[PDB]
């Protein structure tokens, strides 16, 4: 029903990881881009706002889904992308080659027939420098989950009717709940957490013949024995931090490196992680992918590092090398990072002023470097190159290829064309921002979002929102209580308007 | 290609838990009993020696271990039991019936065709009362197992020794990491690591296992008209350490086997030891306190203090004795009575106790006035203990205590000591049990005829030419007082050893 855009699927992303491998990928706003099952097109759609000039095709076996995305198509007039009711073997050479082919959780749960199929156009129907994108659920991690679902499947088979054997199945769930909530063994925490997980989702993937479908349950060697069949070559995962050595002894270390497979490596470190699942990038055999990454590769991305400094930066003096500034990663109290380092805590505070915005690397030496009364900057540069791809290979920096965007003018707020057409015509309470991903808002915030088209100013939109209060059509809540005070609700839409600008300039909602 | 005895496949422990749930199961002694997958019959020949009035037979496919155990039962001169190289699917009718049937470690490892036969015979050749043994892997608990023979495999690709440094650098790349899933994959590979040579085939690793749920495993039973009795390991049954309203639920539903299931997907059940019966055979599932006077008893207990230096009566005293009997699991009791029992139980170890010896021996340490608390005691305790797997139950017979002057051991143990070059013997209860080269010489002599000093006189002549090399503290012998003094120092905690592992006649 909901189709959600997946920012690990971006095609700048699937990019970027290609230039860090040493390929040069086709440009994401010329390219032609496939989806495999695409659903709706909640994946698709947004890339085809961004870019008049690439071509977009998707995919999908459901009538439903496909009205719907040809649906939202129409609804903003975009003619750059179409969408095919059919099932992916009936692809062909005339469909053409690709850029790039996002497959998103499919190739697990169709038959052998149609993940040769996938394998044989994510090799045939793709570009010479094209990626290809594949994600499926992996061996040992995924026999958990096998389990809880023979385990509901074998409760549930006593009645006939689906209504009740849902639940039935969450009356299982929570029996699992019960029986172990004393229990000391990890076993127990583990099923524990998985039969939590299990009971959150809705009665979609809790049908019994959802459950009783089939999982190809491959190992990362099996699945590479199969793209290997086609031609197709590993070229990472895309979350880059799976790919990470040297948590482990440097013994082990060592042994890992001697061996040259990447393949045989991966398939260990499943092994010993527990992996349930991989986002796989594929590409030609035929390209030479270069996995010596030195410390000044950084220089050839641009770089986003998403902190929240503890003490702002007007309350502390950076020149200070005995002081401890901490600052909070994606959130937070469980994680963060501390330096007393004048360097590194200068270009901290400029990735945190910048959040979600790419900054190219001179870009951050020399704001950092402004910070420092200009003088430090070739220990800012070096700083950077000594700390900056250790944490990339970790997953706490995020490097692209997206260019840096211009700071937004905040006085009459700009949202996207994506956004303004979710926040109107859509019931969705989340919007899709411009680094493809979804950002839940409230019906304060989705209000707003209809309103920014670079010509209403604060006192505009405010107005606006508080003609949707009159018809209510909205309501506000400064306690659990709510104010229906003339004077007070005015009030509190300005107390909620800063935060909210704030909010939208850090998740990339703003033009 | 080592044949063991397994002792939770005794059909005397088939014949009590099946008189536990209230089947009156075949006489032992006088029985048939069958084995499927016995070569070398190292867990069928005991039996035989132990009851020369019951029929046993034999069936396996290796060809060199039949012969091995023919060759032990012309040795032991055994005119009851015949083995067969043959397999599972050229038995017969014509083999008839039989009161026990053995199926250990097979099951998993045979093909659907095979499995179909062992589910046959296990109703076609049982008795009316008969009891079937079958034991499966089972599902989710070995998703483990299977995923490090994977590994193993997946590695290979001399075939031992990788295996071994990939165990190895499994520990060592996970040298710590807190997550749960490192400790229990560290220690699956330490304990499979641990296991030497014979499982690592890597013929066997690329074996293929049935991969049962126990659901699966009792719908090919029903198919065949078998229901389930019980489980060999008792306490794996036992419920509550689970929350009350858990046991209401389970036990709203009637259904033992998914039940079972059902505490198999949350305990992750790898293994189960299964009691099938003959479907027309009502089963009592019924347990009373007092059903324990049905058994003999055996408690393994060795107390912290000794009985001449406590007071029973000392009611502010609180008395701990160990289980294992090492240290870890214990059980501590303030009760005169409790006491009693408990001391009874240290003295009598691994010798089956009635209900009126138990009591009535307690009692005597109590000047005889306290019969009726202590048989109080006991009543309200021991079932509870024994569906915990604390204590045992046995429909065997209490034993003679064994006289000392000139120690004895069984037929089969000093066959074993004498002529065997295993390192272990198989006491009375069916146990394997480990042996250094000094107490094995000093099982060879052990008959109703050599005293310590002709038993110690005749280990000498081993040392002597020896092929037996003592150490003390260590690699010490000095051709005299290095010995013969440090055999005395040996000798007496060795006769205890053989006295309560059941060694002794």
Redesign the interface.
Known sequence: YESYPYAITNPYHLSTLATLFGINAPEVENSKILELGCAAGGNLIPHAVLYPNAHFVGVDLSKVQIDEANKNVRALGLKNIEFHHCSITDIDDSFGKFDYIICHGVISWVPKIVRDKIFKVCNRNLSTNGIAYISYNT??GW??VR?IR??ML??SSSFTNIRDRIAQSRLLLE??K?????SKT??????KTEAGLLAKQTDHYLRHDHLEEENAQF?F?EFMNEARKHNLQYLADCNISTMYLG???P??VE?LKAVNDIVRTE??MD????RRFRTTLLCHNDLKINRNINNDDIKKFNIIFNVIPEKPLKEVDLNNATENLQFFLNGNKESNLSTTSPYMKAILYTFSENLNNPLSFKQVTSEANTKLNNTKLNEIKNELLNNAMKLVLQGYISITNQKHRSKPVLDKPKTTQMVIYQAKYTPSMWVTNLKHEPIGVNFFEKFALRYMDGRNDKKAIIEAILGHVEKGELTLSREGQKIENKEEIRKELESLFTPMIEKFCSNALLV
């Open positions: 061996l040992p026999n958990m389990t023979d385990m074998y409760h029996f699992v019960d029986s172990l909530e004393h990890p076993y127990a925490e583990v099923l190992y060697h948590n482990m002894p013994k082990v042994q398939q260990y092994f010993i992680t527990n």
